[PDB]
Write a protein that binds this ligand. Structure first.
Ligand SMILES: CC1=C(/C=C/C(C)=C/C=C/C(C)=C/CO)C(C)(C)CCC1
Length: 133
């Protein structure tokens, strides 16, 4: 299914530190953020996504329209501009973030009651799993 609406609570987080290191997130921030359980809130209406990813330390919001390239400013992350494009490959939501970093993007998809997220940068892959609230 393509319905990713809802509040999603993290069950699993694999190699988040490697992903952050590839983004050149500073040590203090990495070492706190790797500790944390995340929540994702997604509002999806047709093409239009509004997403909020939260932790006790820092949040990240990004909104986009599927199939419409946009300038993403990764504030609170590595603070870079990328040309972001989110599309559907089957039922997998695929984002490519064009810019300074090679192989940068993510893939997000539903399996049953869970949301899977794969974050890539350079040669690093972070895999996350969230359960629907
Ligand atoms: C790195 C980093 C963080 C960012 C998490 C990420 C990478 C969010 C990705 C959002 C996406 C892919 C939306 C579709 O779900 C948080 C704020 C948790 C803590 C501070 C350091």
């Amino acid at each position: 299914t393509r319905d990713q609406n809802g509040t999603w609570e993290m069950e699993s987080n694999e190699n988040f530190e490697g992903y952050m290191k590839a983004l050149d997130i500073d040590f203090a921030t990495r070492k706190i953020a790797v500790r944390l359980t995340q929540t994702k809130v997604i509002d999806q209406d047709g093409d239009n996504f509004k997403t909020k990813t939260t932790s006790t330390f820092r949040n990240y919001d990004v909104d986009f329209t599927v199939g419409v390239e946009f300038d993403e400013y990764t504030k609170s992350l590595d603070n870079r501009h990328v040309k972001a494009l989110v599309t559907w490959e089957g039922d997998v939501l695929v984002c490519v973030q064009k810019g300074e970093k090679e192989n940068r993007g993510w893939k997000q998809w539903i399996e049953g009651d869970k949301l899977y997220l794969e974050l890539t940068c350079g040669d690093q892959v972070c895999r996350q799993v969230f359960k629907k609230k």
